[PDB]
Nucleic acid binder design. Structure first.
Lengths: 185, 70, 132, 67, 56, 129, 53, 152
RNA sequence: UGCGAAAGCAGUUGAAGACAAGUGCUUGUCGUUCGUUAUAAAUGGCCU
């Protein structure tokens, strides 16, 4: 693939979703098999109101691909999340983040979405009813999120502590999904 | 001529230079120049005198949905 | 006072150097300074000139005893602020900076002056007491 | 000379007025120094204000249509 | 306070220590003096708007 | 403020969505029942979609999107589709109509009709006097 | 109260308990006891007032 | 129900996880926590509100960087409670500086509304008198410090 | 951006390429380059 702007790998490690400038297009490929091979321009996903507005709205900052490949989550610097159904390219809008979303990760089943950004709050979106739960007052903004376990027992998070502009201060956090308490910082 | 939000005047002695949200209308319905949109909405428009034009314009609690401002 | 107002208006149109002389004329008083600004300063160009002349004068000698030139600046800023900052001339901003520098000094000055004046009041009162 | 950057010259005067003491100071001069300072205080207040200055539908309306 | 300093100035001078025993004056006076630059700034701002609508 | 989908034969709840912040005063559906539109006091119009094939097989509705178009309550809503027409018309205390496209509700343009459109004039002027 | 043994991983043992409270306890299975508290319903808190049954 | 009294005096392991009950939070604190900026200002200016408690919500909003945001959606009707307090708080040394900031913003944000509203004008006339009164007091304290320096 | 105190004292904010929009021309943009020390605005706010 040429001129890759953004790339992500599914949690299982068998699907790769990446974006290229060939404005830009999203393509998803299965790695160990030929079952999944899809491509489409970003214009199709994007809303027209997004087209009318400033570039922040058309700027994707985070990307996630479900294990089954049916769903794909696209973040935007405006703070909006769009879940797109690969089967029909239908769009779904989840809007809570006021600032750019930096981390998106699907659960193994695909029913729950971990989102994190400048808000210093990790949000579990429940996609069945579009509800959500929060873990706020984290030590720093969430660069990355992941669900780590055969059953999603643990959540692995990367924090930045943006207060210190002199250096990048990364903190790796392993939370027990049971009670959302820091198992290992 | 005037509509809900527009007013127009056409002189009938002069020919003009040749140079989504409604039914597409594939089916049938059964079976010198001035234009201004400055004045709206208009209830009624008429001339009081030869050089006098009359424009008549229109001059509840609602559930709050705040607009974020930083 | 009508004559000086028309005289000052003419010099503004004539780009004369006597605009300053018109301004420090003693005939001016507080209300007439207001009325001239509100009624006669209608062009942006004239507003720039009067501000430039005044600010250069105050910048050179901010401690002049004459309150007339500062009085002009006070009401000019109060009444025509919207038209003034509309000016985008670089020299005007530099001129505003130069004036700001001179005035900034004086603000720092007052705590010491009050301390001296208060000191001096005590010395005067004791002399009165010794007299009695 | 005073009664006849300046702050370092003024603030030096305050040091004089301290060193002279209460007793040595004689009334006649003290009046003149008072009027001069009272003038200076007024000017300082006047300039200070200027510095802060620099930092800072009808039911029925008549118009003519353009045509 | 003004008369106490004037009358007993000679005695007040000849005291081993004043800051410890007059600390309340210095504390109270320092607080009020510190406010002077800001209060003036508001006075200029208030005088501006007060003049503006009065003439208008 | 809840929208609930019930199974008719057994009279049970299949899904519950806590969508609105206030009363849900009207509901309407498209021709094939691929979309259910709600509106109410909170001035929002929520689109619930079941267009995807996997959704149809599993019979699960989704809170697809929402839009704020009205200045006040939304009391009446209706939907019409034809080979040449696609309308989602709504109105309420604002006293004006709002028209959308059912198929392209999330991204399609909308029109706000005039409050008073004087086909029958309620005011006259006499040139004399 | 009740024991629980994961059907796949037989080595897993756990004890769930509840009361007239808005939280549930789980005890993994000797200096200390590994006890975790379930107190989050993910938006359905209104429907559930007590974990007692 | 006889087991409530027991405190595990005989049991092998005692596990204690209940979080201590924190004092209830006042109305203004709840609004700030929920990001209700405009309401937090209102809860400040209510009858029978402790002056210290009123000063914090003013400082707290300023610290948060939400001063203009708290003053957008307002008119003369809901602006007077602030001006009334500012008419009084300007006297106190502790709240003088905070009064300085807020009054500066409202003038910079409601100059136009000020002209058309008479009641707002009388507030600022009285406010101008009181600040002028403070200038005399603050100046006088400096004069005292001047003399007090001479003695030493 | 440099220096300095916190006040301030000096000095900048250029050029090219490409895309979109409107009408070869006009404007706006850049997950494009070279050189110099060099407003925002997708109804979107923090758990138990």
């Amino acid at each position: 693939w040429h001129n890759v702007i953004l790339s992500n790998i599914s949690s299982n490690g068998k699907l790769l979703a990446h974006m290229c400038k060939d404005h830009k297009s999203i393509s998803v490929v299965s790695l160990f098999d030929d079952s999944v091979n899809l491509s489409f321009p970003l214009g199709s996903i994007l809303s027209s109101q997004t087209q009318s507005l400033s570039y922040n709205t058309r700027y994707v900052s985070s990307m996630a691909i479900d294990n089954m490949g049916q769903q794909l989550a696209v973040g935007f610097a405006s703070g909006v999340i769009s879940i797109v159904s690969l089967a029909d390219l239908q769009i779904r809008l989840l809007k809570w983040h006021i600032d750019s979303v930096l981390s998106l990760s699907f659960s193994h089943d695909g029913s729950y979405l971990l989102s994190g950004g400048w808000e210093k709050v990790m949000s579990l979106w429940q996609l069945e009813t579009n509800s959500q739960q929060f873990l706020p007052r984290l030590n720093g903004i969430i660069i990355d999120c992941q669900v780590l376990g055969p059953q999603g027992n643990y959540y692995s998070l990367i924090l930045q502590m943006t207060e210190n502009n002199s250096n990048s201060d990364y903190q790796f956090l392993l939370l027990n999904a049971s009670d959302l308490t820091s198992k290992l910082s | 001529f005037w509509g809900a939000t527009w007013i127009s005047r056409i002189d009938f002695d002069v020919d003009f230079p040749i140079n989504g949200l409604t039914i597409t209308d594939e089916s049938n319905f059964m079976n010198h120049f001035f234009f201004t949109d400055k004045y709206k909405p208009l209830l009624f428009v008429d001339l009081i005198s030869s050089n006098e034009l009359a424009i008549i314009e229109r001059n509840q609690k609602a559930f709050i949905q705040p607009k974020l401002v930083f | 006072q009508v004559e000086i107002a028309n005289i000052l208006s003419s010099h503004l149109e004539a780009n004369s150097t006597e605009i300053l002389d018109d301004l420090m004329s003693g005939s001016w008083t507080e209300p007439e300074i207001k009325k001239f600004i509100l009624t006669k300063i209608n062009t942006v160009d004239h507003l720039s000139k009067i501000f430039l002349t005044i600010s250069k004068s105050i910048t050179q000698n901010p401690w002049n005893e004459e309150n007339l030139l500062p009085l002009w600046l006070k009401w000019l800023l109060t009444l025509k602020s919207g038209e003034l900052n509309s000016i985008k001339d670089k020299h005007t901003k530099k001129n505003c900076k130069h004036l700001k520098s001179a005035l900034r000094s004086s603000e720092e000055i007052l705590p010491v002056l009050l301390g001296i004046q208060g000191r001096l009041e005590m010395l005067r009162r004791q002399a009165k007491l010794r007299e009695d | 000379f005073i009664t006849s950057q300046s702050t370092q010259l003024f603030q030096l005067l305050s040091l004089v007025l301290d060193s002279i003491g209460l007793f040595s100071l004689e009334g006649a001069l003290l009046e003149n120094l008072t009027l001069y300072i009272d003038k200076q205080v007024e000017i300082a207040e006047r300039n200070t204000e200027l510095w802060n200055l620099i930092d800072t539908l009808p039911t029925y309306t008549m118009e003519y249509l353009d045509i | 306070v003004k008369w106490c300093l004037i009358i007993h100035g000679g005695y007040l001078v000849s005291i081993p220590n004043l800051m410890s025993t007059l600390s309340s004056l210095h504390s109270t006076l320092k607080r009020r003096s510190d406010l002077l630059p800001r209060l003036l700034a508001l006075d200029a701002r208030l005088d501006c708007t007060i003049n503006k609508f009065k003439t208008l | 403020g809840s929208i609930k989908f019930w199974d008719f034969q057994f009279a049970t709840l299949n899904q519950s969505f806590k969508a609105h912040d206030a009363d849900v005063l009207c509901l309407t559906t498209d021709t094939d029942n691929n979309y259910v539109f709600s509106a109410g006091v909170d001035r929002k119009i929520f689109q619930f979609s079941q267009n995807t094939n996997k959704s149809q097989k599993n019979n699960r509705w989704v809170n697809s999107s929402n839009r704020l178009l009205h200045g006040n309550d939304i009391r009446a809503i209706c939907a019409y589709q034809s080979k040449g027409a696609d309308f989602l018309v709504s109105g309420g205390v604002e006293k004006t109509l709002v028209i959308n496209s059912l198929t392209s509700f999330s991204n399609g343009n909308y029109r706000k009709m005039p409050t008073v459109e004087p086909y029958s004039k309620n005011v006259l002027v006499n040139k004399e006097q | 109260c009740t024991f629980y043994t994961s059907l796949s991983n037989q080595n897993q043992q756990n004890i769930f308990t509840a009361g007239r409270r808005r939280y549930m306890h789980s005890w993994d299975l000797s200096q200390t006891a590994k006890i975790e508290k379930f107190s989050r319903l993910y938006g359905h808190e209104s429907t559930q007032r007590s974990f007692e049954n | 129900m006889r087991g409530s009294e027991y405190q595990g005096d005989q049991e092998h392991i005692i596990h204690n996880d209940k979080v201590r009950s924190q004092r209830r939070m006042r109305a203004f604190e709840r609004n700030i926590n929920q990001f209700k900026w405009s309401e937090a200002l209102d809860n400040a200016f209510v009858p029978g509100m402790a002056k210290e408690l009123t000063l914090t919500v003013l400082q707290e909003l300023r610290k948060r960087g939400k001063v203009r945001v708290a003053l957008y959606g307002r008119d003369e009707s809901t602006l007077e409670p602030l001006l009334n307090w500012c008419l009084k708080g300007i006297e106190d040394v502790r709240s003088a500086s905070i009064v300085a900031d807020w009054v500066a913003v409202v003038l910079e944000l409601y100059g136009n509304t000020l002209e058309s509203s008479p009641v707002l004008q009388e507030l600022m006339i009285d406010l101008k008198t009181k600040v002028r009164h403070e200038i005399h007091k603050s100046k006088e304290a400096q004069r005292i410090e001047g003399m007090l320096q001479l003695l030493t």
